[PDB]
Design a protein around this ligand. Structure first.
Ligand SMILES: [Zn+2]
Length: 226
RNA sequence: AUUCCGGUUGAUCCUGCCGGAGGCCACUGCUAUGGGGGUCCGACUAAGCCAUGCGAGUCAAGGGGGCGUCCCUUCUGGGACGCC
């Protein structure tokens, strides 16, 4: 219950500034599923700390890309660090973020904060021909997501099959809780930022697919926590 | 595993090729304790050329002969089984 007591400490010594922060602090909101699909803005990392306190674990925190960028000036070179990171719990909830700094540590901190701010909620299940089980071990059905030039299609896979995707998408899916999947990617996958954002968009798009009431039972669809 | 990674810029995103990464066959450096199973080993260039030995024989119950043994009447001539 270390994460639970961490959440209690945050809720104690946190002073809300936004409407959603006030809702959480006063107690109108108790479960993270309430802050989604309502149009609210998440601008305080303390909200995510309180509602998903496990995202602060190192095992649940993943730094994806570190890049050095240069600005030219009459004096010389101005170096800056761009860090692309991802956080989340290994059940339904994942987030991705970008941070910039004069130092790698500052960039990492800002990227983690922005990933927490951008956290989303996904849907999991099983819709593969070779599995036909009813567990949230893979994506419920085939989805697509594109960022820039990279197009990523995620397809359900049989239980026990590893994550057949690049390293970046593999880490993102592992943080999101998905365990088995097949992938088809087109475009420049070496662009880590675009690849990660395409995987993130593909995971998010699971909520854009209309489904029938019986499909939930058929595919074992689970929203957010399981 | 229905996968990616490095490389064009002071820095970025694309198109595009090259390389890395896996499997199979052929030649080859270094090195090598065993035992089993298999449809492996002068096909790639010369279906180019070959010393020597062997790789197609069998039948005496189709036929007449020769050499040897035996049984012999006994100069006669007859019968067999061995080899040719
Ligand atoms: Zn399944």
């Amino acid at each position: 219950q270390e994460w639970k007591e961490y959440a209690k400490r945050v809720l104690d010594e946190w002073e809300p500034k936004t409407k959603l922060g006030m809702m959480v602090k006063e107690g109108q909101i108790t479960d993270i599923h309430e802050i989604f699909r309502r149009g609210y803005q998440i601008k305080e990392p303390e909200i995510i700390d309180v509602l998903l306190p496990e995202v602060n674990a190192r095992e649940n925190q993943e730094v994806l890309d570190i890049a050095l960028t240069v600005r030219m000036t009459d004096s010389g070179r101005r170096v800056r660090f761009r860090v692309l990171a991802a956080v989340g719990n290994r059940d339904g909830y994942v987030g991705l973020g970008i941070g910039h700094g004069k130092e790698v540590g500052i960039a990492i901190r800002k990227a983690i904060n922005y990933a927490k701010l951008n956290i989303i909620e996904i849907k999991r299940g099983c819709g593969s021909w070779e599995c036909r089980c009813r567990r949230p071990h893979s994506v419920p059905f085939a989805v697509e997501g594109k960022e820039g030039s990279v197009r990523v299609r995620l397809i359900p896979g049989p239980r026990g099959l590893g994550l057949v995707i690049g390293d970046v998408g593999k880490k993102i899916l592992r943080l999101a809780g998905v365990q088995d999947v097949w992938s088809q990617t087109f475009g420049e996958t070496r662009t880590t930022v675009n690849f990660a954002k395409a995987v993130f968009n593909a995971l998010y798009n699971t909520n854009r697919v209309a489904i029938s009431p019986e499909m939930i039972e058929r595919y074992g669809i689970v929203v957010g926590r399981a």
